[PDB]
Amino acid sequence: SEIERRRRNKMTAYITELSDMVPTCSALARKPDKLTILRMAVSHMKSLRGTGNKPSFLTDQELKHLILEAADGFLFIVSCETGRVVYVSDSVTPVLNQPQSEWFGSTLYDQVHPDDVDKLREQLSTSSRRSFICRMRCGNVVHCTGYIKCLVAIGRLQPTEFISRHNIEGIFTFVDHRCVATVGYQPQELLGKNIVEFCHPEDQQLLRDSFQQVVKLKGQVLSVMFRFRSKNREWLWVRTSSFTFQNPYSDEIEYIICTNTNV
Amino acid sequence: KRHRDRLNAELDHLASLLPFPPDIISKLDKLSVLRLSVSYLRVKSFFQVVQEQSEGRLLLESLNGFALVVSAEGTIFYASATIVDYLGFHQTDVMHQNIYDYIHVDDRQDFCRQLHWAMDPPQDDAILGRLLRAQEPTEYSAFLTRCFICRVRCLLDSTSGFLTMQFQGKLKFLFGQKKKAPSGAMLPPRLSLFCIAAPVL
């Protein structure tokens, strides 16, 4: 015993991964043993972490990249007494289309109206995290979370879109559960039904034509806008984007995949 | 023998080069040293390939939630340090582990579904080629957004031992992972979930 092979194997599997990730180690003709793989891992790791000092998995800019890949927003900093527009991120411009210099020493009201801005007036006072939803913005959604230490908060974007898959006729074969919040139905109420059954009469030809065109696009995406009948019986404007693909497993004919967004 | 001593000395080397304070490093065993070493190289390889294709801390603190990156096979490629503030698991417990070990049994299947490009996991390389070639917000970006709720193992919860969290993010190609076929050729990168994980209150 010799009872714990699972830890002995795990080590070996990790050693193999080090061999793949160490640039010169994979390129060797002679398959290196465990010790020489580890030694090459040491050198490469020493090189990556650099000549000191304080240890961090990601550098600040790398962490930033990951957050902004996942989320879509910008950092903004203000005070209670004064405005005071202290600092704004360079990724403010892609989030809401308004340039960098407009925030530096400018009025806080300019991008938040109309017209209150009365909620924020007492949110500034200490009474301590203070998360809230705010009015931004129509030129030409910002759910901003932060904490006081003078506020430091991100300005970021619940589901407004859902995926579905369809056979060639337009029948729902898969429905993403985000459909509940977006159009009111459970997946089970859409499965088996044709999408055209939820399409407003005046949009039906357009929708049928779109599905004929997406087949001819052979994997390229087409968007169309139409009125979708939600569970509460209201007609909701929706933009669908769609493309086909040859599904392996069934060899089955072109498979339509759709994303459905309420504008 | 003396060879076992040589192996362990290199593991000590590796441990001392890990990007964590000595108080965390000293608590790790040899298996975690390796796991975290692999973890570190994989993350640096990703950022090297991203570098070729050409705060931060306050933004991390601002979020009500932690940053998370899960690979196509369910590996935790990255978790931010604030994961401990929500789940009680340290960054070092979680890195390069299997995500499904931290997801409630009945939610595992959904979570798996969220990682697939069409929410249709097998129980395919051609279409990902188009997705890859489209990059360098593409045509296909609207199909790759993800927002779902899932129960995550939580050491700070004294009842179910699970925290209900909303995972919000996008599927993106995880470059620089140097996966290879049996033939020896380099596999193309696969899609991973880049997300923020926030508690539902």
Question: Are B170 and A67 a contacting pair at CB < 8 A?
Answer: no
Angle between helices B30-52 and A5-21 (to 10 degrees): 20
Q: In what order do the strands lie in the sheet with A161-166?
A: A172-175, A161-166, A254-262, A235-246, A222-229
Residue B175 is part of a domain; what is its CATH number? 3.30.450.20
**Residues recorded for chain B:** 201
Q: What three-state secondary structure class fits B148?
A: strand
Q: 């429905």: which residue's tokens? A: A175
Residues of B in contact with A57 (CB under 8 A): 19-20, 40, 43, 78, 91
Q: Are residues B138 and B45 in the same domain?
A: no
- Enumerate residues 6+ apart whose C-beta is below 8 A from B18: A55, B25, B28, B33, B36, B37, B40
Question: At how many Å resolution was this determined?
Answer: 2.4
Helix (H, G, I), strand (E, B) or coil at B18: coil
Q: Among A192, A217, A196, A193, which Cα is nearest to A206's?
A: A196
How many domains does chain B contain in total?
2
Residue whose C-alpha is closest to residue B42's, from A55, A18, A41, A39: A18
Which residues, other chains included, contact A69 with Cβ-Cβ below 8 Å and sequence gap of 6+?
Answer: B169, B170, B172, B194
CA distance A49 to B38: 14
Method by which the model was determined: X-ray
Tell me the pairing of strands A132-134 and A142-148. antiparallel
Tokens coding B148: 């779902």
As a whole number of Å, the end-to-end CA separation of chain B is 56
Q: Taking Cα atoms as reference points, which of A197, A179, A196 lies closest to residue A188?
A: A179
- Which among A22, A70, A89 has the least Cβ separation from residue B196? A70
Rounded to whole angstroms, the Cα distance separating A259 from A159 reads: 12
Q: How far apart are CA B41 and CA A26, in angstroms?
A: 14
Is the domain of B130 the same as that of B158? yes
Distance of CA A44 to the CA centre of its chain: 33
Q: Which of B37, B54, B71 marks a domain boundary?
A: B54
Token pair 């290199």 is found at: B10
Cβ pairs A/B, distance under 8 A: 173
Cβ contact, residue pair A42, B13, below 8 Å: yes
| B95 and B30 within one domain | no
Relative orientation angle of helices B30-52 and A60-70, to the nearest 10 degrees: 80
Interface test with B, best of A14, A90, A217 (most B CBs within 10 A): A14
B69 with B25, same domain: the answer is no
Q: Which two tokens stand for residue B193?
A: 């979930």
Q: Do B161 and B130 share a domain, yes or no?
A: yes
Q: Are A152 and A144 in contact (CB under 8 A)?
A: no
CATH of domain A5-49: 4.10.280.10
Asked if residue B75 and residue B21 are part of one domain, the reply reads: no
Q: Residue B144 belongs to what domain range?
A: 55-199
Please, what CATH class does the domain formed by A161-262 belong to?
Answer: alpha beta
**Which CA distances in Å does A115 have to A82, A112, A205, B70?**
19, 8, 42, 42
CATH of A60-156, one of 3.30.56.10, 1.10.1040.10, 3.30.450.20, 3.40.50.920: 3.30.450.20
Q: Is B194 helix (H, G, I), strand (E, B) or coil?
A: strand
* CA distances in angstroms from B45 to A15, A20, A32, A60, B132, listed in the order given: 17, 11, 21, 17, 18
Closest partner residue to A38 among B11, B40, B118, by Cβ? Answer: B11
Q: Measure the N-to-C terminal CA separation of chain A; round to a whole number of Å.
A: 63
Report DSSP state, residue B182: S
Spatial distance between the Cα atoms of A71 and B130, rounded to a whole number of angstroms: 24
Q: What CATH number is attached to the domain comprising B42?
A: 4.10.280
Nearest alpha-carbon partner for B44 in B194, B186, B193, B177:
B177
The H-assigned helical ranges of B17-134 are 22-25, 30-52, 57-62, 83-87, 91-94, 108-115, 125-134
Residue extent(s) of CATH 4.10.280.10 domains in chain A: 5-49
Within chain A, which residue ranges are assigned CATH 3.30.450.20?
60-156, 161-262
Residues 6+ apart with CB under 8 A from B164: B149, B150, B151, B152, B199, B200
- Which residue type sits at A189? E
> In terms of domains, do B71 and B146 share one?
yes
Alpha-carbon distance values, A9 to A13, A64, B2 (Å) = 6, 36, 21
Strand order in the sheet with B66-70: B76-79, B66-70, B191-199, B162-173, B145-153
Residues B61 and B34 in one domain: no
* Domain identity same for B103 and B186: yes
How many CB atoms neighbour CB A42 within 10 A? 21
State whether B120 and B174 are in the same domain.
yes
3-state SS of chain A is CCCCHHHHHHHHHHHHHHHHHCHHHHCCCCCCCHHHHHHHHHHHHHHHHCCCCCCCCCCHHHHHHHHHHHCCEEEEEECCCCCCCCEECCCHHHHCCCCCCCCCCCCCHHHCCCCCCCHHHHHCCCCCECCEEECCCCCCCEEEEEEECCEEEEEECCCCEEEEEECCCCEEEEECCCHHHHHCCCHHHHCCCEHHHHECHHHHHHHHHHHHHHHHHCCCCEEEEEEEECCCCCEEEEEEEEEEEECCCCCCCEEEEEEEEEC
From the candidates A4, A48, A57, which should be mutated to test the interface with B, based on the most B CB atoms within 10 A? A57
One domain for residues B91 and B154? yes
**Strand A222-229 vs strand A235-246: parallel, antiparallel, or unpaired?**
antiparallel
Is the Cβ–Cβ distance between B192 and B172 less than 8 Å?
A: yes
* A249 vs A151: CA distance, rounded Å: 54
Is there a contact between A21 and B38 if contact means CB atoms under 8 Å apart?
yes
B62 Cβ contact partners less than 8 Å away, ≥ 6 residues apart: A75, A145, A146, A147, A152, A153, A154
Same domain, B88 and B38: no
Angle between helices A34-49 and B2-16 (to 10 degrees): 20
> Taking the CB of residue B2, how many other CB atoms lie within 10 A of it?
5
* Whole-number Cα distances in Å, B39 to A173, A177, B78: 38, 33, 8
Q: How far apart are CA A76 and CA A143, in angstroms?
A: 12
**Could you tell me how many residues make up chain A?**
263
The beta-carbon neighbor of A46 closest among B17, B127, B194 is B17
